[PDB]
Ligand binder design. Structure first.
Ligand SMILES: O=C1C(Br)=CC(=C(c2cc(Br)c(O)c(Br)c2)c2ccccc2S(=O)(=O)O)C=C1Br
Ligand SMILES: O=C1C(Br)=CC(=C(c2cc(Br)c(O)c(Br)c2)c2ccccc2S(=O)(=O)O)C=C1Br
Ligand SMILES: [Cl-]
Length: 129
């Protein structure tokens, strides 16, 4: 599923992400925009044999189990395929564990580069939340 901006903001709010770990809702929307372009089925392979899965591009070496990644730790205790669902619940629950570890939201390289240091509130502005 490809979400719209405010559509996703509302879904993330419903799952308690506003100010989770101190990160305002716009941070999470911005992260999804630049990690996956709001696409719940996004997948991207990496040189280390891992793959990043879903709306928040959750990695299969540390966080989810995809059965094919050397060194898998499965710290979210979730199969990676569940992170490709149209409903964001499993991805949000794993993201809450990631942000509590991957040194806050720096675990999301696209957020680090393309969101951090900008006025991320613009990502929720004008949404009926
Ligand atoms: O249940 C839904 C569904 Br279905 C779609 C959308 C939207 C939308 C708009 C475009 Br344009 C787009 O390309 C996509 Br995908 C979705 C949308 C609609 C009105 C205002 C803002 C948005 S937006 O801020 O969410 O974009 C909102 C909800 Br709620
Ligand atoms: O399937 C949809 C689609 Br598509 C759009 C919308 C909404 C919406 C629509 C427009 Br237009 C807009 O500019 C904005 Br912002 C939000 C909406 C979202 C959350 C709360 C209230 C509305 S409400 O405004 O519809 O009451 C709800 C459903 Br369900
Ligand atoms: Cl702006």
């Amino acid at each position: 599923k490809v979400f719209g901006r405010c559509e996703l903001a509302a879904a993330m709010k419903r799952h308690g992400l506003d100010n989770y770990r101190g990160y305002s809702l716009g941070n999470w929307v911005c992260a999804a925009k630049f990690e996956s372009n709001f696409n719940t089925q996004a997948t991207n392979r990496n040189t280390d044999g891992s793959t990043d899965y879903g709306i928040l591009q959750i990695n299969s070496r540390w966080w989810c189990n995809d059965g094919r990644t050397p060194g898998s730790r499965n710290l979210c205790n979730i199969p990676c395929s569940a992170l490709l669902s149209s409903d964001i619940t499993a991805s949000v629950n794993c993201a809450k564990k990631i942000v509590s570890x991957g040194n806050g939201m720096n675990a999301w390289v696209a957020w680090r580069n393309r969101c951090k240091g900008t006025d991320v509130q613009a990502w929720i502005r004008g949404c009926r939340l």
